[PDB]
Design a protein around this ligand. Sequence first.
Ligand SMILES: [Cu+2]
Ligand SMILES: [Cu+2]
Ligand SMILES: [Cu+2]
Lengths: 388, 388, 388, 100
Amino acid sequence: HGEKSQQAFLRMRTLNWYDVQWSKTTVNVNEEMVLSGKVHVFSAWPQAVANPRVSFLNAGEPGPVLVRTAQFIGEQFAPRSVSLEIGKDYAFSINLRGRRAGRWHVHAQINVEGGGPIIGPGQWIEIKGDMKDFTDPVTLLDGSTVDLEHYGISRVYAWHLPWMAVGAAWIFFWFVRKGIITSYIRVAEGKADDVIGDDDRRIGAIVLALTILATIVGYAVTNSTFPRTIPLQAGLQKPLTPIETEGTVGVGKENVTTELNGGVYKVPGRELTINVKVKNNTSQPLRLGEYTAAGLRFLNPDVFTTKPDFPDYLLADRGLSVDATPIAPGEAKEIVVKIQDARWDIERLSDLAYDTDSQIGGLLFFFSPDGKRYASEIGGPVIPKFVA
Amino acid sequence: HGEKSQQAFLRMRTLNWYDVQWSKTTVNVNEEMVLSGKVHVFSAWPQAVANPRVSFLNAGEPGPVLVRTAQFIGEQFAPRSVSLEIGKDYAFSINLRGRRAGRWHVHAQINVEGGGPIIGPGQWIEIKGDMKDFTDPVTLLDGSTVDLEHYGISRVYAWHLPWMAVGAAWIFFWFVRKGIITSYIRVAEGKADDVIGDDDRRIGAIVLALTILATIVGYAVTNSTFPRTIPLQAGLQKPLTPIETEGTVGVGKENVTTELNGGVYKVPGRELTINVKVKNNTSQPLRLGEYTAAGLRFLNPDVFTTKPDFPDYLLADRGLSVDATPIAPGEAKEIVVKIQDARWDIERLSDLAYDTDSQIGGLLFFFSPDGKRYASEIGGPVIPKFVA
Amino acid sequence: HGEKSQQAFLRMRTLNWYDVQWSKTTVNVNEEMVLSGKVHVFSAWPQAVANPRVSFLNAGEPGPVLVRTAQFIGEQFAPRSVSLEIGKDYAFSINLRGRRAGRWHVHAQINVEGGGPIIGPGQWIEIKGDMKDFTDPVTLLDGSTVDLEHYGISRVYAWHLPWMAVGAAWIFFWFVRKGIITSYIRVAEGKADDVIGDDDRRIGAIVLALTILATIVGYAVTNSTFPRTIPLQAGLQKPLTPIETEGTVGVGKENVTTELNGGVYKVPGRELTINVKVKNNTSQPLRLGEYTAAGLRFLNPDVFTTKPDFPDYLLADRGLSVDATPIAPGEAKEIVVKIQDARWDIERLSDLAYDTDSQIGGLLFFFSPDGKRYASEIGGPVIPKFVA
Amino acid sequence: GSLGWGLLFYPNNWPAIAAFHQATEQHGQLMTLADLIGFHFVRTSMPEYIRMVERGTLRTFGKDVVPVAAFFSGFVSMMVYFLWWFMGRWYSTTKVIDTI
Ligand SMILES: [Cu+2]
Ligand SMILES: [Cu+2]
Ligand SMILES: [Cu+2]
């Protein structure tokens, strides 16, 4: 939920999220769901954020209200850290299992090691049931099942609480057999040996013998239960495979390319106006239908006549307009694009005035007569207009 | 001017400067001029110098004798740091405007973050006029103009001097109302309270109230003047676009490739003899016309019958010779090249004997029958000949 | 010899050694030999080991029992550090000269700056003769020969031992002319000046003038002998050239590609079973003849009916099998490959259960009807089977 | 005292070191005898990259490498000398304490 407070320019110029989807928006305790989507690694990665050579997919969520059961990105199962290449796109998905009854807002998230959290689109997901009923389970290599909700916790208490009890007993022993005040006085007066002589040392030599013993025993037993164990599995995963369908920025024979060429945003305000040198590059006439920034979607309603299923906070129908004059094929055309919506302000993207680099980022989505969507990356310096 | 003292091998094997040019060599105070040129990022970049992933274009010049007005490299406006890829070429230019009357020696310069200054060719630039006359100016976003030569400086003084005066007053106050010696003595004797009792504290309490107040006020006021300000704009710039015309090392279908295959320089001396494996690769017969090293130009006078406009210190007419036997097309030929000129020694390139890596670098320029110039990178180990 | 103790997974997923060859396995003192081979830089380089951007080729050998005379890698003479690119193959060779009579085990070795030693295949090499007879020699730039076995060593002693003697003399002098005990007592009593007054100071002033003099002399002399000297030559070498014949992973028009898809190894054990998605990709039918891991060779005896010359500890004839059903051309086939041999356990590759990333690596070698060998990289997670 | 100690270090070593800074050409490369000795007599754990020796910089101006190093060692030795003198004293302590 933090995303509003993060720096506007970093949000636009790092990860570009698209096609984010939640399998369900209501689930029972124990029922699965999948958050999925695609992401584009911005080609002019900001200094402020380390190279995303080391990154981690995650479910942006208030504690384990939903248990993650697996996740994937770059066509790999990704429980560990992964490399993202600057300029490429990756598809990801995260299998979530309902655990805690309530109405939670659940995000796509990636963390970069040099830089921190990057928060994707999030959606409310209602969970029904009683957490008492939640289980896992999980299959060991030996074939047996365990429920991770509870597995191992008994043994932990079985070891920890006895020792803490023993520890307290030992404190209370000495505290009783000698005072605090008595012992201070004794030591201060001179003896000292009235506080401790063997066989106080006998008692200690025995307690210690018992302790080492209990420790050798406890070790050997737990070694018999559980005779085959492995070290934590850790380390960066082999390189990912980017999206190649179809396309999909700088992929395939046919594409659109956009160069930003001046921009203006109103401070305070709701507006951004940009000039874009388009080239196309495809063998189709294209109209510009969409501009995505920080998960935010700005829609040309000439293209999106309907009008997608996607989180309210983040869905705008004024990403307009072309003239509907579909450009090419082969044609190169500077178009003025005027972005206007309340959400630009509400998601604090207007606070780019506060940032230390006044610069826009994101994907432009162009569409043919038929379905076919062609994506190009837009970005560069924009200037503020200081209004009343 | 430092370049001579810099280590020979690092100067040859980092940036390779070509086509450097000074719009003018004489200019009035306020009159513009452009320094421009191209640079080739040597393909075997030396350990000692950090990767040029973070660099900065600069006017090598003795303080602001000429104000820089803008600059560009890799086809971008470059007021901040830029990335140079190893192997590529970039073109740059710097708009200078005359400020201080005199005869200054103005270089092209690039600094690498890991490594330090790399100094390109420089040229004398006379400036005429009187610095009293120098102005900028510069347009704010609100539309108004300011002269940067003077802008803001009053307001600075207006704040700083009164405070220093207040500071001085307070010191003098106490130094008078109580002595140094009297105070020392009083304190040393026992009192102490004779030096400071309220209402010395009353005076302090009031001066502090007055200070805080003056601070709040001066803050608020400067907030009313100037109610719209931005943070300094900082950070590395998006990747540059390399030179692609038209050949231009490892670009296009047609090219020359040179391998160094033995070299000998005289210590002490003026000479360097190198064997080069040429391959061409173009569809034209090529003669070798030039060798550039550290901004230094060694010309074949068979090709340069005339004989370019370029700083005297740096222009040699003994980069000779081929046999004038124009090689190919398609032909692969080991040729002996003999470099000899006073400037090799004068620019301390002979001091490669002193260096920790005895190794040559730079560009070879081959020419067709007509104009067409084809550039290849040469470099690798050379051996000294220890002469009398 | 240490290699057995190194972590199994690091060994498999770093350098992949093939075609390692020892010119001789018996040699006389002063007689040459060449260790040569090729290496493949695994494509999913482990976090635990720095990028091999800085590495060094070496003869894994117990002190100088053989003197290295030259070495080469990436078609470069490599006395200094070199870059290895992830995914590429490089061929290397090392010229060794016999020096110490005995039976030594001599390895191919590469060290990565971030990470440490990677040990190649090693072979026993018998050396015959008497070390007394060993020489070099070596030719200086001025033309003269020297024998490095002995060159310079006299001059060192000539300078070192006098000064040590002089230093002792000085100690003994004061030790005698004053006592330890006497001097202590004197100083402790009050004087102090009875221990040292000029002309003890005169003796000092003279010894010092003699010392500086001897030092100016010795310098100027050694400056006359040896009047032309160079600093140590140090630094990373220009980028290597990878193997392009022919091929040879991800090189040329025709190739095999393997994807690991599940694996099982027995703990404890001798066995590894892997499913391999093959594609081919060549215009020939291919049988899988070899799997190389850590220098270890696992051979299909259907392909290797004979049966190569290669160190016993490291040569296995159960890398079997296909069905001998030669796959393609153009065919994509998932094949079960069963690796079994004592050497898997002996070279501690079974101690992958102990590692912190349970994961296999290496080259698969496919063969046509005729000779032609087509190499593909295999690697990925395996699972252990916990047996009795 | 410590300034001379610094300055004299390279000079009093030169006589022993100069032999090995004679040049040689191996396979097209320039090498000192010193590089070549290290190169020939194979150490299992001594990769050339590990050295930590001068490899050049864009701020060396000369010709000045040894003299600046010698003076730098001189000036820094002053501080270390002070510190170690006083530690010589501390270690010369004859203090007797009363318990452990
Ligand atoms: Cu949220
Ligand atoms: Cu100059
Ligand atoms: Cu061995």
